From a paper:
NRCs are essential helper [name] (nucleotide-binding domain and leucine-rich repeat) proteins that execute immune responses triggered by sensor NLRs. The [name] helper CC-[name] [name] exists as a homodimer at resting state and assembles into a higher-order oligomeric resistosome upon activation by Rx or other NRC-dependent sensor NLRs.
The α1 helices (residues 1 to 26), which carry the MADA consensus sequence, were not resolved in the [name] homohexamer, indicating their flexible nature. The most extensive interaction that stabilizes the central part of the resistosome is formed by the embedding of each HD1 domain within a concave surface of the adjacent protomer lined by the NB, WHD, and LRR regions. At the interface between NB domains, aspartate D239 and cysteine C241 from one protomer contact threonine T234 and asparagine N225 at distances of 3.3 and 4.4 Å, respectively, in the other protomer. The α4 helix of [name] contains a bend near residue L126, which is at the end closest to the resistosome core.
Numbering used by the authors:
A (entry chain A), B (entry chain B): 27 to 85, 103 to 132, 144 to 299, 308 to 329, 338 to 376, 392 to 438, 445 to 501, 509 to 651, ...
Amino acid sequence: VKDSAESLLQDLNDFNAFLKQTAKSRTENDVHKELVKKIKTVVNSAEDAIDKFVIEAKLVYDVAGEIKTIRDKVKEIRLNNALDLQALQRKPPVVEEDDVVGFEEEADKVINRLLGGSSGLEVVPVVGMPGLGKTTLANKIYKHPDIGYQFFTRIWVYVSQSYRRRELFLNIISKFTRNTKQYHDMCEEDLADEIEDFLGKGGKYLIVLDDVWSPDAWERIRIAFPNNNKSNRILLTTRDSKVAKPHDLKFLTEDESWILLEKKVFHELSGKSIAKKCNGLPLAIVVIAGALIGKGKTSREWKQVDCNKLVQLSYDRLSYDLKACFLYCGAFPGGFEIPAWKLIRLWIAEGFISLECKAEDNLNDLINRNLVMVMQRTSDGQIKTCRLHDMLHEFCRQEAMKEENLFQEIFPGKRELATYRRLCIHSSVLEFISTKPSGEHVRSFLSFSLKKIEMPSVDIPTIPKGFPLLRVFDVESINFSRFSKEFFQLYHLRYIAFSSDTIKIIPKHIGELWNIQTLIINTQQRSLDIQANIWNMERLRHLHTNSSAKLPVQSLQTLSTIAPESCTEEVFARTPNLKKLGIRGKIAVLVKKLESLENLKLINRLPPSYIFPTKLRKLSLVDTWNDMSILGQMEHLEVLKLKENGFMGECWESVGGFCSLLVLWIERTDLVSWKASADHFPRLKHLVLICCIPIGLADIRSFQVMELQNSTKTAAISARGIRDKGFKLSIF
Amino acid sequence: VKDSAESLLQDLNDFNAFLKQTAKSRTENDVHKELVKKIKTVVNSAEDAIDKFVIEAKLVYDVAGEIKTIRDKVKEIRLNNALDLQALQRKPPVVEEDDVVGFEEEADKVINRLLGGSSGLEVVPVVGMPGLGKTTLANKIYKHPDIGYQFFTRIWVYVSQSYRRRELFLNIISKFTRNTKQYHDMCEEDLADEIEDFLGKGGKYLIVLDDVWSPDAWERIRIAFPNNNKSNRILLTTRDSKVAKPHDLKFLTEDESWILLEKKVFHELSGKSIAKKCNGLPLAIVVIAGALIGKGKTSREWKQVDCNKLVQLSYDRLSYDLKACFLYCGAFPGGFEIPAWKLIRLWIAEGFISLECKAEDNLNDLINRNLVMVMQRTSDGQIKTCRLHDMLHEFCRQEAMKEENLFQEIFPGKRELATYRRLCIHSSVLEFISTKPSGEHVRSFLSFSLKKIEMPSVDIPTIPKGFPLLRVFDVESINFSRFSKEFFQLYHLRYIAFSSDTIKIIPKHIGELWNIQTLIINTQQRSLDIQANIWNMERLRHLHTNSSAKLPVQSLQTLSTIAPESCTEEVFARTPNLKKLGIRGKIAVLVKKLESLENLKLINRLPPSYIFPTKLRKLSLVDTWNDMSILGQMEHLEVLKLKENGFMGECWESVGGFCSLLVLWIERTDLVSWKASADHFPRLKHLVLICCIPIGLADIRSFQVMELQNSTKTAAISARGIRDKGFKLSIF
Ligand SMILES: Nc1ncnc2c1ncn2[C@@H]1O[C@H](COP(=O)(O)OP(=O)(O)OP(=O)(O)O)[C@@H](O)[C@H]1O
Ligand SMILES: Nc1ncnc2c1ncn2[C@@H]1O[C@H](COP(=O)(O)OP(=O)(O)OP(=O)(O)O)[C@@H](O)[C@H]1O
């Protein structure tokens, strides 16, 4: 059976290489698409069989039969479709010029940015979502009367993914001379020099480089534009934020969306609801208006209404792994606030992806390409939450549900569920669960709902029974009263995330699951006792709990909210690579050996400063004023968060030197008198005071962002005075 | 089984020919890459099976089974992937013009070289590493105000690997006339004559020939440039040193590297450490700055950071054997000082490559292409040590570890080690050894560490056990207390290099290994007794020991530090091809028959000069003044090194005539009075005096390099006076 496993592994590797090769091009051939789907199904079957054999080897007849039948299927596919297997390995946009809604103020903003500045060649980059309207705004600015009056020469160059520098340079030359047959033998650099002479002969010039996709194209084309100490400007529209390094183009409002839809259809509650569902994207409004123009003007045909090639331009530029990472963001429901940490852990568990660094790099790559929107950011600048735009969400859902079978949103029949690979259900979870589903190839069970669900006791073991091959089990919105004997049979589990109301103890049978990477226990009990062999899990990396978990007496990276009785030297000696640590166990009971620790959280007198780790970067104290001199000696502390009565006192005088502090966060304190000088916070950048101000922080060079919340008006006056003395101040 | 061995040899030969053919082109097809990897794996398996059969034949059932299964695998591969097997058989650079750091002095140097010289057409060649900045410096010089003022005509020609002479000539012509349609029927020689007329009509001309790759291109393009007795100049940038036969472009300093990185990212300790790790290569700085511009400006995302197509241009021009020789240099750790002799012997033993002459030619070819950097050179001009640049080291490591599986740096599992071919481990050697690794296909075990390691006795036979197919065993950084019975079972050994502290005797069972080529015994004992049948090793070529080895009573080329009791006529009659010989055995105890000897070393009254070999070229005496008249009669001696009290005396008067001496090396002597004239050293070029001067050596025509070290200031004054009377003098 082992040699059969090796042969099946070789077949699966060749099929995976074929799938990776065919993903480089989109095929419209239906036979090729069907063959690709068949090959993907066989690949999934082979993966499941190999994982089953691996689990049995770690711990057989049915496994052998499955391996034989999958090998036979592979041979049949190779023999039958050999020829198909071998065969499977410029229009500038027309934008609106007459009825442009909402861009009247953004156009003036960009124009005033173009008409003002230094005397050098400056660039005004416009970045935005696919179909946001960057070309429309660039055209409105390009044909504006003020721009035409100020700029003697205006040139519109349409760059794209595919362009020829010689063709572009000869197109630019034709705007100045008609005898372009004299350049048939000059090189592209001589063409650029000729363009430089042409542009320098006149006055100021404005150049619109539309749809720049890489900095390489920008550098190659820029050699034709002189910098002759005149206020020459370049207007650049791009999807990627890297090419702009800007002006982030706005979204249309609800009223503007309705205005655009009404103008496009008619040169109504149903119409207003249709325009509201486009989320301020003019491309969606245009597409839906083109669809509505063909239907009759009847309220019943507009209630039935309640593109794809433009998005594919940026989706086809993603790598093979980044495409699967991007499509997995469509599993989260529409408008959902995706937690970045949860998304990263899910990506690592699904096998798409230190691994955390690569996953954060993938998320930042998706954000830079404007495929993912950021809303919440951490105080230190990291991303906290994100979401997909509704058109991007629809694209991801359609692609991953139809063409890739990455996941299926849920009722499917017994024949349909046998082909599903991942399940995402957030509505009518109990109704689907009561049907007793059974999927032998389902690898993930996702349930992202913000409403808590209590799982009936009679239905407790249905998911571990019907889906025994689960690798990801994210049911943190479902309360599990108890664990059945079938949960411990999920030997393939890598990501487990459950919520509970009465689970005060983790059984030792959890340690029988040696594939666990992330163990998230969201319980409302005050204390939790983890009896499972945490240290015997060789693949465990993160352990998140919201209670005071008590660990039993290398790859581990996070130990969130453990009890201080579990802060022994023996326990900390088993986790040399720990980076984030939290304690929520009556701090008064009590980490030096953790030389890689960066995040520390204590939730409820400070010891000498030499006891705390010297490499700590972020420290947060919750429910625990002159004691801050101990935290001042921390030479590497950069973020300090005080939440929920973290530091209580009346008078605080700044004495210690926070040589590395960048963010100071104080929440729910009784501080009355605070005296400080610029010397005590040399590197301060971020200051947040919520539900709580010496004028010495205006002398700080790095102080640029200050956040204020509800408090006495004297604090608001002090903040306003500090702002008067770019600074960002917000008071609420 | 013999006929099966012949059939498998034929199959392996065909597969090797296929692998050699596909290496001529880089394939981006993933299916093709997987097929190439599979074919390489099968080739390795066939090679191991054939060598096992050869060893058994020299000295069976398992060998037959392995041969049958490998033949079946070959047939299956041939039948399955026949179509894939059959299918498997211009952008000038844009460089920085505004922010160029560090080149302000190099540009002035090259400019003063261009503006000064004779009245003929001179060339200023700029040679350097891939990405060093030759094009940037050439562009800075080309657009310099002084160059523009002095040279009326300046032409920038971009040569590359692929160029068309007609296209280049028509591009040059277009710089002088716009009616280039009159040249549609002239030959390229008439085009060159027209260019000659155009360039001779004006004044002086400067021409920048960028990226010249072969002297043939230089000769073909040079026919268009007249030599009209004006100070016409050509600026040439190339990677190969042969095309320049120059100006070796400098590397950016650490401060300059940080300046460039800061300028590129921001138009920090982490930033300084990132710029320091680029090793002064502006291409690496540019790439890392482009990478950093996409990440957020947070200290945590800059600590996570702690191209390839440019290097591939020079790597793809290497031959099939030179590519493997080059990638093997990446086995040595980063920044390691690779000994040239050890590298050559390793290349010969690995089968990449008299053989020593070819290996030295390969090393010099790699050096000329600027793929390998030379730091230490022998006193006679030969190369002693070398290293790889860190970008080249990374390229070699990545290529040989991912795409070729040439070697793997080390923990890998039992399934992963079954595919490894060579192992390089220099950190945590004992930890990996204690895991008891077992690789049935591992052919080399490399450990290049400068820190000595004592090998536990319980772990002594682990390497000969887990790796029974070893061909190269370089563990000279590991001390072996004793030899286990498994060491003598390594019948495939070709290169054995071990260190020891108490091994005073080599067992006779070493002679059972008849495949040994290099036998390096690095022991700290004063004397060593080699009982193995050295003369029975028909393939032994080099025998290096640091102790007084006592040999027992044709291919041999080196016998380093043997005892003079082993300098008998009988022993020397068995080695007619010996070229290097050393003796470290109390020289007072005592080679004429060695008619091919070149190097002789005696380590502790001279006999008549007719006793010493007449062919001797280099002689070194260690611990052994009027006796130098005996060495003077040596008509072919060119290098004479005196180290560690080699020649002791008070007064030395030069009498003998060193008609062929080129290098004189004196170290740690008590010489007080030295009298000499130009007649006694007619051919002297190199003079080194360390830890020890008549003015008669200034009359020597060939005296150009003099090296001095710590001594009395009178010697420094004499050296300075000699320099006053190009000469290279260094005093420390
Ligand atoms: N403010 C607007 N008013 C009216 N129509 C608009 C407006 N903005 C965009 N459109 C229209 O919606 C579509 C959006 O395409 P457009 O070229 O403006 O987008 P883009 O930002 O350049 O996107 P892409 O990245 O795909 O090039 C076009 O048909 C355009 O005419
Ligand atoms: N001194 C410098 N200051 C700033 N940027 C530099 C400097 N030297 C090189 N660069 C930049 O680094 C890269 C090096 O490429 P460059 O063309 O200068 O190298 P090269 O010596 O011609 O190499 P190749 O053999 O690959 O052609 C370019 O992007 C160039 O702009």
